[PDB]
Amino acid sequence: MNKILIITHTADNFSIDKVTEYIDKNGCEVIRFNVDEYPLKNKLSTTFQDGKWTTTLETPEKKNSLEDISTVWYRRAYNIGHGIKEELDAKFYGAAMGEIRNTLFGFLESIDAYSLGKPSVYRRLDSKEEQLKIADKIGFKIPATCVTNNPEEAKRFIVKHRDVVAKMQTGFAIYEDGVENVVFTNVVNEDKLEELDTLLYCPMQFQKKIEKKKELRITVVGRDVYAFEIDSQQSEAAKTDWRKDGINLIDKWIPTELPQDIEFMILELLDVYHVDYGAIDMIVSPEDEYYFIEINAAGEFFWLDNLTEENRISKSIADLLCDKAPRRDNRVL
């Protein structure tokens, strides 16, 4: 039977258990590759010899052949090289981690079978600027945006656009007193336009503050589109960034149906990027305008998937991986 390689980590069963169950129900085998345990607890080998390629993933219980897989799902790659820091002398650690990451991600890129996710693709979609530009070209409404390290450009943008929020392009936790502090989306205090001095040392992304009649999360699996809605403006904490109250709002999400033009444009976004998975965040304003905010190429789906009946999103993912659903084929030669 067909073999589906799932790139994940040992703390990720919550999002892959149902997908594995539905793949098994579909008649294909699942090969789970936990990348925490690479290279300490599992062995990865790629060999070309005598004109033949072979790839072996060897766990203490099972040797899996990977050269004849039919699909790979690049789901998560957390904590690669866990435990090496305590094994290797400190002088070799950074270089060894660089080599481990290059080897792992280069094997992932080198899979010529159909892939749901790849390093190059995920890193292309890291560019939020290209996301907004492509969405504007498609016809999406996007907020007014200025990404810069130039203080006076930001000042002009903040005075022309009165209600403006600030945003980081990357996620990061900063440790203070053993506490993990992070930077949500915050409205820019319009008197606090001093202190934008700081802007020279590290850029930021400013956007026109969109009033939130509702907030939409749209999970696209191939051509299947699961849209969910949330009312963010009922928590004074979650009013500028719903994630600031996420754990309380995690079960308040409601299924919704998009206007057909919005759905066609979302499918066209995935066609332009040539990917079969996406998590699109949008904001519907009181005047009923749909604003494209972001597309996450590897976003979470489990918490919305558990609001459907019998995990429909996991079923769609399993069908896409088992080739029982139409694909945007990305096989390499």
Binding site: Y74, R75, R76, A77, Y78, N79, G117, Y122, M168, T170, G171, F172, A173, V182, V183, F184, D241, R243, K244, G246, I247, I250, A279, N296, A297, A298, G299, E300, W303
Partner: peptide, 11 residues
């Protein structure tokens, strides 16, 4: 920045 929806693939 936040990872309550932790949509990053790396970590």
């Amino acid at each position: 920045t936040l990872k309550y929806p932790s949509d990053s693939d790396e970590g």
